[PDB]
Amino acid sequence: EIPKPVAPAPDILRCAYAELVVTDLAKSRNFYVDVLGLHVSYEDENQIYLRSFEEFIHHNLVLTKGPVAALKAMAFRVRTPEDVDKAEAYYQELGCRTERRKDGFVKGIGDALRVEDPLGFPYEFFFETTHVERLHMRYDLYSAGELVRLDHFNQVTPDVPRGRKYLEDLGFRVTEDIQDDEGTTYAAWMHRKGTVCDTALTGGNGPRLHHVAFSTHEKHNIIQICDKMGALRISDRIERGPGRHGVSNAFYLYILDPDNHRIEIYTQDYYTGDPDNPTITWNVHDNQRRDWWGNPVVPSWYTEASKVLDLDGNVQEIIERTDDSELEVTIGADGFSFTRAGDEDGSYHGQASKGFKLG
Template identity: 45%
Template sequence: MPLPKPNLYPPFNIVRLSHVEFVVTDLALSRTFYVDTLGLQVTYEDGETITLRGLEERGHHCVVLRRGGKPVANSLSFKVYDEGDLDKAHDWFKAQRLPVEWVERPWQGRTLRTRDPIGIPLEFYCHMDRLPPIHQKYKLYRGVSPLRIDHFNCFSTNVDDSVAFYNSIGFRVTEYTDDAESGKLWAAWMHRKGGVHDMAFTNGRGPRLHHTAFWVPSPLNIIELLDLMATTGYLANIERGPGRHGISNAFFLYVRDPDGHRIELYCSDYQTVDPEHEPIRWDLKDPQRQTLWGAPAPRSWFEEGTFFAGVDVRDAELKAQPIVAP
């Protein structure tokens, strides 16, 4: 199926991805992982909730950790340009016969909750409490020194349909993988903020959250994190990498938090802001697609992911298989 023509004048203006809310079963263990090991900064904590931000971020949080009995993701959140865009988003999703409700969220202004057609829970807001800058407080840099949240990747049962939907609200494809036999999309990377992606889709059992990624200063920070994790009890949490993706050209590492939520540490992709930017195509069987150096991903990377709270999953419609590590 051909890619849709980019929609440069969407019905409302999404600035970027904003934050994810995870349910975790042990808040203390999660704090040790996200704060003491990865290096995210605490902006609020009590016995039920911890909020975190990256070192370059001025918004109150990019991650919300909530204590609960089952590890799931409650929502993926996006920032819109102004309050008028929130109203436009409400009316647009309602016109698509998708559920809409205004919800209260701490540290945020009006927040719209909805979902996409395959069931991914989405929230949109304009205003979040602002915090003083800390990017030059270098004594705070530790772990992998995450600077900011970068993207989400979700399993989709039909990547063509997901691309068509997100294209309609202004996300633009930067790179994609298709299956030569069927002509259907197997994966796609889509952006709002001018990097390779804010949102990506991978063919698979879904909808589920595949991973949340954080931008880090350099590949050296990732190597230092590996040394730290390997000597502080987190060896089994290292899932894939380090390496350089063919898609996006980014240097990467995938790790799992204590509840299995997948986190990518990521840097060095490229600018895609020009409206005439042309997407890059990759064949599903190209070994450099996953990793520029040719190393295939483990089976867990294609099969495991975080469930969304209250959302049923189903098998992917496309049965094509990528190269998988033995």
């Protein structure tokens, strides 16, 4: 269990960017720029720096060429320069490996701290960043599938309560979670910026990065991403969706980049900024908790996720989840889910909803 430091937590504003390692920079560029329409802030033979339509900081995504595709850093902006020092003192008191660079780890970020956090995740904290042209009224550039904001990260970790307590001490507040009647926690969402989440924990073998999520303005923007992927004859890279989430109430889609990094496209969750924001707990067997329309969750969504790196750029070793598996207890041969609690009609036993079993 992770103790609460005596040192004050840094004041975290929001998720700000991820740095993903990618194996073929040109094919990743085709996906993020040509298919998804993200905006280039800088690029060279080694890296592509990308931002969403409404962003003013330098980037939301950095694609770094390297030998092994993986999450290199998930970065949170903090409220003041001094909060970077606070983060350093906090993680040092946790006994975590830290690395400070006064001039940043990536272009367009200044003074920055990277840490191997207690769950094995590479986090960055920074304040200083190079401001760029905010493209939010550049409707001459606007795509039918325009990605407007970075919304959140989602992390796979074997012990959700242990992770949750740690993120609570860091100032994140839980908005929604998924549990069962026998006291197991399968997932939790938690926030700083007043949306449903900034980062989220998914119970599973880890550390691994489940996804990075971008917003659109409207639902039709997400439908267009699907339609465009069908036109490009890359519908096999649509993993799951589109749907309505139970948890978050957002309209969603999950797609896969060329190195199998999962991207969620997301819109229209709700305000969580009040400090007594009501938490919402879903039962793991509730077949409307993940897709509100009861569509089945593809098993890859539960099993696959990206490697993460340590601060030397080596892959973090995986620790196996010992708590019950969400896949197994819902859609596996011994699983079940319901539409109405207590009702056998519209319940599924040993298979997924809507007439499928696991492939």
